[PDB]
Amino acid sequence: PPKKPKKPGXNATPEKLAAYEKELAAYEKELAAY
Fold this sequence. Notes:
Strand content: under 5%
Radius of gyration: 10 Å
Shape: elongated
PDB class: de novo protein
Number of helices: 1
Assembly: monomeric
Keywords: protein mimetic, heterogeneous backbone, DE novo protein
Distance between the termini: 7 Å
Structural class: mainly alpha
Organism: Streptococcus mutans
Order of helices and strands: H
């Protein structure tokens, strides 16, 4: 099963927070595909 991306703290930078959102989106895509 696809692994959950490391959760960032509230003090995350907009770019990395957006990046995390994309990684989480990827998680959902791969989870659905699984």
